[PDB]
């Protein structure tokens, strides 16, 4: 058992990176939600028809 240590170190580094990625995603979701809901506070809106959808 010689190469087992390198694999264990790599697995630990991957787990540490995954924890940080999960934390970053949790932190980023709050910013997106604060704006999405802030816009959702605008129930007062307009009701109209649909004309066309071009390719631009």
């Amino acid at each position: 058992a010689s190469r087992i240590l390198d694999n264990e170190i790599r697995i630990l580094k991957e787990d540490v990176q995954r924890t940080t990625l999960e934390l970053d995603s949790f932190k980023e979701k709050i910013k997106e939600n604060q704006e999405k809901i802030k816009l959702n506070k605008q129930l007062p809106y307009l009701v109209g028809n649909i004309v066309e959808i071009l390719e631009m």
Binding site: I11, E32, L54
Partner: protein, 375 residues
């Protein structure tokens, strides 16, 4: 040994996937963060440019100001009357778009999925050939008519007693392009708005000019046509104006070439004197009640999905079917099942049709019996 690396990689792969999924989910929402930060642009129709940069266009709202365009929008590409977006907050030209689409136009454009085949149509084989020569023969080789010395047919209206089923003729004729056809009931095109009644017609002729090969058929044409208005109603003024606008757009200082319109009406006597003129109504092809052979052909067409016994003598019924209307044969075929539905007789006997014909002949006793008058 390397067997230990495979076990450890199973955690690194999960760690990477758990980060990639979270990043994709966060980016999905963050996209809307910048997407919902813009503002729309008002759309107007240009009148004319006054200076090399000064142009006058009326927006979709009303009173029109004069504004400029972006310094790279190919000013010459801004047609005199073009439809483009303005700097809604600034009211300046930003980008141009094709002509309008009149969502009612789409609504009446791709709302007919009928796939009628000429085999289904019957009783008007000579009428089928005439109508073909009426509309599709022109698009086939109008040079033939030119060499003849006359212009191709302008527009043909279908004359037929009520319940004749002319509408089926148009539904089948829709089997020549299936994308180059136009069918408007000529009664939903009316509105109580200020002037949109003429707007529908304008959009019709515009969308027609847009695609060269296409036909416009307008059933219930007897409604908007009418005879005239004696100052009776406050819509007859607007209704008569709509009728005249269609008359004008027909052959008014402009020919709608590569496209002809076929209309149908049960009452050719309440038709305005103008619509019957050679410029508006080209030729009148009248669809009469089915003949004995026509009635038999119609019965056979409708007699497709009948579980019966090999004794169905349609000849006796056909001789019995006197003065029946075109839809009447389908009604008899349907009532055949209803009689068969009674007693739960799975097969259909020749007696079921013999009783359905008798029931139909007695039901229509309350009719009017006034076919038509082509004057």
């Amino acid at each position: 040994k390397l067997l230990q690396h495979r076990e450890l990689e199973s955690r690194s792969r999960k760690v990477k996937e758990e980060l990639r999924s979270a990043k994709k989910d966060y980016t999905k929402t963050e996209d809307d963060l910048k997407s919902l930060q813009s503002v729309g642009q008002i759309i107007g129709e240009v009148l004319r440019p006054l200076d090399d940069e000064r142009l006058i266009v009326k927006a979709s709202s009303g009173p029109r100001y004069v504004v400029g365009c972006r310094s790279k929008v190919d000013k010459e590409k801004l047609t005199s009357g073009t439809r483009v977006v303005l700097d809604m907050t600034t009211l300046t030209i930003m980008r141009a778009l094709p002509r309008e689409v009149d969502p009612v136009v789409y609504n009446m454009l791709h709302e007919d999925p009928g796939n009628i085949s000429y085999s289904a149509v019957g009783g008007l084989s000579d009428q089928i050939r005439e109508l073909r020569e009426s509309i599709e023969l022109p698009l086939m080789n109008p040079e033939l008519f030119i060499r003849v010395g006359i212009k191709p047919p302008k527009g043909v209206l279908l004359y037929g007693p009520p319940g004749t089923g002319k509408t089926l003729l148009a539904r089948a004729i829709a089997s020549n392009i299936d994308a180059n056809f136009l069918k408007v009931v000529s009664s939903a095109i009316i509105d109580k708005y200020i002037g949109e009644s003429a707007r529908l017609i304008r959009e019709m002729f515009n969308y027609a000019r847009e695609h060269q090969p296409c036909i416009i058929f307008m059933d219930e044409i007897d409604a908007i046509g009418g005879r005239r208005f004696s100052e009776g109603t406050s819509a007859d003024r607007e209704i008569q104006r709509t009728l005249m606008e269609l008359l004008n757009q027909l052959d008014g200082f402009d020919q709608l070439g590569k496209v002809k319109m076929i209309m149908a009406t049960n009452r050719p006597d309440v038709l305005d004197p103008a619509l019957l003129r050679p410029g508006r109504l080209d030729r009148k092809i009248e669809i009469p009640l089915p003949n004995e052979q026509s009635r038999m052909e119609i019965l056979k067409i409708h007699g497709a999905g009948i579980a019966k016994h090999g004794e169905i003598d349609y000849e006796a019924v056909v001789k019995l079917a006197e003065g029946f209307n075109g839809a009447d044969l389908r009604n008899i075929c349907t009532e055949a099942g209803m009689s068969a539905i009674r007693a739960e007789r799975d097969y259909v006997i020749h007696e079921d049709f013999m009783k359905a014909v008798r029931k139909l002949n007695e039901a229509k006793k309350l009719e009017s019996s006034a076919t038509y008058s082509a004057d």
